[PDB]
């Protein structure tokens, strides 16, 4: 199906001594492949997926060069945003950047992204046309003017429509064994009696990749969201994900309820019952 490459960048000022804590991570789909941490000893961009290790010394030198240039930019930004917002030297503050490209099943440009936050709030984002900007406030309007003059949008659109999608295609190919493999949910159902009259049924989905999944309850063939609980999809830690959804039902009536599971790795949707 479709794929994506995203880079996430977090910088956190340290007041009193020295530079910001800076962390960078790269993802293809739901798989992390690269990282830089300003506090690690190596001071190099580091592999996190075996298929990136195929890439050689020059790639790593260049990715290190650029991720350090990103962190300096962020250092300057934290200083400038402090002024912009009339803030003190004492507060710790955060900048966040995200960028990336999405591609359809054919692997052709669908969508590009570039967005920036200060203390967890929208600051400035590239609009979907990749030609103009959403500046959340007057500080970000100033930033917006500066980036229009310096034609940031035209530079990023070229990376996003061009470079980003070319390197994703190469990553997909090199990492095919895993990146182009879907792992279907291992499903099962559990039962718990809260009291003499009230049961809880829980429908589990495990070991699936990618993370996108849909889990729902039906009653007598109709959707039931009332008295149901859904957990956030969570990483297992081995590269796969887990979710469950649960419904509370009258004791004895467990056979009216069915769990429905939808995922890319199933050629058709699954239905589960409590036997």
């Amino acid at each position: 199906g479709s794929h994506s490459m995203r880079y996430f960048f977090t910088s956190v000022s340290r007041p009193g001594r020295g530079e910001p804590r800076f962390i960078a991570v790269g993802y293809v789909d739901d798989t992390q492949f690269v990282r830089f941490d300003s506090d690690a000893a190596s001071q190099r961009m580091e592999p996190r997926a075996p298929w990136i290790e195929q890439e050689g010394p020059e790639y790593w030198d260049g990715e290190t060069r650029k991720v350090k240039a990103h962190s300096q930019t962020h250092r300057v930004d934290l200083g400038t945003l402090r002024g912009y917002y009339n803030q003190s030297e004492a507060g710790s503050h955060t900048v966040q950047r995200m960028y990336g490209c999405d591609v359809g099943s054919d692997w052709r440009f669908l969508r590009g992204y570039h967005q920036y936050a200060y203390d967890g709030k929208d600051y400035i984002a590239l609009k979907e046309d990749l030609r103009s900007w959403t500046a959340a406030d007057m500080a970000a309007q100033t930033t917006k003017h500066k980036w229009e003059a310096a034609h940031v949008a035209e530079q990023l659109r070229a990376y996003l429509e061009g470079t980003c999608v070319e390197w994703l295609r190469r990553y997909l190919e090199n990492g095919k064994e895993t990146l182009q493999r879907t792992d279907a949910p291992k499903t099962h159902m559990t039962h718990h009696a809260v009291s003499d009259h009230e049961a809880t049924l829980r429908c589990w989905a495990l070991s699936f990749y990618p993370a996108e999944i849909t889990l729902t309850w039906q009653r007598d063939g109709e959707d039931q969201t009332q008295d149901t609980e859904l957990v956030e999809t969570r990483p297992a830690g081995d590269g796969t994900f887990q979710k469950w959804v649960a419904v509370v039902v009258p004791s004895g009536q467990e056979q009216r309820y069915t769990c429905h599971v939808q995922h890319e790795g199933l050629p058709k949707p699954l239905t589960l019952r409590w036997e």
Partner: peptide
């Protein structure tokens, strides 16, 4: 790969 261009200061 990371963007080489268009990461400017605010």
């Amino acid at each position: 790969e990371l963007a080489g261009w268009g990461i400017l200061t605010v």
